[PDB]
């Protein structure tokens, strides 16, 4: 049988969780930036990031189904103890990083929805109910959650689809932007945003989810007829799930690039006064450009297209916040299960991630204002960017060795493509790390920064060397 909807339906379910794992509030903010910084021109990189991410997903599905152990478990059996644990903490930092920008995303959504009545720190404390929810599920132990993901995608698409219809962007521009890569006259900050988007799309821990989710399904490893079909249908399920997420992502970028591109602060202030929305003093009266964030972007969108659009945007962010949390605990539970072989319930994982995440976030909210609160999102975005490759070297390093993947190793073209990719990502990171070091130019603060940079480069180079032997 070439293809059958019956086999698809019987082998679905990993795509549902994978889809929502690709729309964390970090990604929405990442797609938000291109809407007012680069417009439609920087849209093709989104497709390239998704396409590479999908190609990485198929490797996660291959590794997950070829051997019963997921990628975290097989990581425990390959690297030495010191590289294992240091990698273990490195990937963990992504989950705390992922949960950190989520609570900023959720808190901002509360503040916009509450017309400023509920304060910022109120939003930060309002996500503790998410932890309370996770405890309640653990007591009940439903353990299915597939309807939650399906509904969560449904509200996401409906909310952002309403945004796309209301904005009504020109289909010519988005088609010309997506299918024709063009990006000229850019400096280091522009490519810095470019690497930010590709890092934000390919989240490092999504490989662990797919490996574990594929492992859940039962399949005869020894017999070669079951694994090939299971691999094919899981790959096609990833393609559908990734296509839906990318369609939603292109919805947001096209929405924010149509009307919020090249608009000075005077014009948006003028329309805000005409609409008489109370949130009008945020934009200063000057000739300078417009800067967009979750708080500001929702405000101007509400000014331009009524409070209805703002509230729908706030709801959409909240759905993203819930999605990032659910994939956050799922990622954290599986990695700790595999790497150091520790069994912890989901309630333990969310409590650890949330309690660590809200400690700085509530403090900066009390001390600094909301503009700096979204300013911290820059720090998380770049930190996630330097640690983006840690999802690349491990996946092919492990899905390249003959003993571990049996005779289902990747073809020659896949190996050379990965080798080019890791070299490209290594060169980009070493290019950026020296620039970030030069930014400070201190005497001893540069020393500790240099020591950290030396350690991270040594880890990255060792993984790269391991990949080269593997390939």
């Amino acid at each position: 049988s070439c293809f059958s909807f019956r086999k698809l339906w019987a082998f679905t379910g990993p795509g549902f969780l994978m889809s929502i794992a690709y729309l964390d509030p970090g990604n929405i903010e990442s797609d938000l930036q291109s809407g007012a910084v680069a417009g439609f021109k920087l849209l093709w990189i989104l497709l390239l990031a998704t396409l590479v991410g999908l190609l990485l997903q198929r490797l996660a599905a291959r590794l997950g189904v070829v051997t019963g152990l997921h990628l975290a478990e097989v990581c425990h059996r390959q690297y030495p103890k010191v590289p294992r644990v240091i990698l273990w903490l490195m990937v963990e930092l992504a989950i705390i990083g992922s949960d950190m920008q989520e609570v900023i995303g959720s808190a901002i959504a509360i503040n916009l929805l509450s017309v400023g009545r509920i304060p910022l720190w109120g939003g930060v404390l309002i996500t503790i109910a998410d932890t309370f929810v996770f405890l309640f599920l653990d007591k009940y132990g439903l353990r299915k959650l597939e309807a939650f993901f399906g509904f969560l995608i449904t509200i996401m698409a409906l909310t952002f689809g309403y945004e796309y219809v209301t904005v009504k962007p020109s289909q010519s521009q988005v088609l010309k932007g997506m299918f024709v890569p063009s990006c000229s006259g850019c400096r280091t900050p522009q490519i810095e945003q470019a690497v930010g988007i590709v890092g934000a799309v390919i989240m490092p821990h999504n490989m662990y989810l797919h490996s574990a989710l594929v492992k859940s399904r039962q399949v005869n490893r020894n017999n070669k007829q079951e694994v090939r079909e299971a691999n094919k249908y899981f790959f096609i399920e990833s393609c559908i799930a990734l296509f839906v997420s990318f369609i939603i992502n292109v919805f947001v970028v096209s929405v924010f690039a149509e009307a919020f591109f090249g608009k000075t602060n005077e014009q948006v202030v003028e329309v805000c006064t005409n609409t008489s929305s109370p949130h009008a003093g945020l934009f200063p009266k000057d000739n300078s450009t417009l800067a967009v964030d979750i708080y500001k972007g929702g405000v101007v969108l509400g000014c331009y297209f009524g409070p209805a659009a703002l509230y729908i945007w706030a709801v959409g962010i909240l759905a993203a916040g819930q999605s990032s949390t659910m994939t956050g605990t799922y990622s954290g539970q599986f990695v700790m299960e595999g790497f150091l072989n520790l069994k912890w319930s989901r309630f333990a994982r969310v409590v650890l991630t949330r309690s660590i995440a809200i400690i700085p976030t509530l403090l900066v909210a009390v001390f600094q204002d909301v503009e700096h609160l979204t300013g911290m999102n820059d720090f998380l975005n770049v930190l996630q960017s330097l640690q983006l490759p840690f999802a690349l070297i491990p996946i092919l390093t492990f899905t390249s060795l003959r003993p571990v993947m049996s005779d289902f190793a990747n073809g020659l073209g896949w190996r050379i493509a990965g080798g080019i990719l890791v070299l490209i990502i290594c060169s980009i990171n070493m290019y950026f790390v020296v620039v970030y070091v030069r930014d400070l130019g201190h005497v001893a603060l540069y020393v500790v920064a240099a020591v950290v940079s030396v350690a991270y480069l040594g880890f990255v180079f060792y993984l790269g060397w391991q990949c080269l032997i593997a390939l």
Partner: nanobody, 120 residues
């Protein structure tokens, strides 16, 4: 369909200041890169500066940095140069050019009508 008209030509003494404008219509100039040129008498056309606007970045040529400033008003669909401390070597025919990639592998160049600027 592409149209560009330059306004702000004339005679100015060395060390003066003046503001030049390219006004264009028929396309969304806000979304497209904007380049600027000057053709000195007896010399070839040369890259002066351009507002690519992918991040509202402004790039200047070597003999231009620190002396000329650029701005744009997409509301008026127009671009402005403010030139200060004009030196006698600045004498040239000034032209406004739009580089529409065409979403293909070849670009198309459209020039304005050309304004003459004189420096003593």
């Amino acid at each position: 369909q592409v149209q560009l008209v330059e306004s702000g030509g004339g005679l100015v003494q060395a060390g003066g200041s003046l503001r030049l404008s390219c006004a264009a219509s028929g396309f969304p100039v806000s979304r497209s890169e904007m380049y600027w040129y000057r053709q000195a008498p007896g010399k070839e056309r040369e890259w002066v500066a351009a507002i690519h606007s992918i991040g509202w970045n402004t790039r200047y040529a070597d003999s231009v940095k620190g002396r000329f400033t650029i701005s744009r008003d997409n509301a008026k669909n127009t671009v402005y140069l403010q030139m200060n401390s004009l030196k006698p070597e600045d004498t040239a025919v000034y032209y406004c050019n739009v580089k529409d990639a065409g979403w293909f592998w070849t670009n198309y160049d459209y020039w304005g009508q050309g304004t003459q600027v004189t420096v003593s």
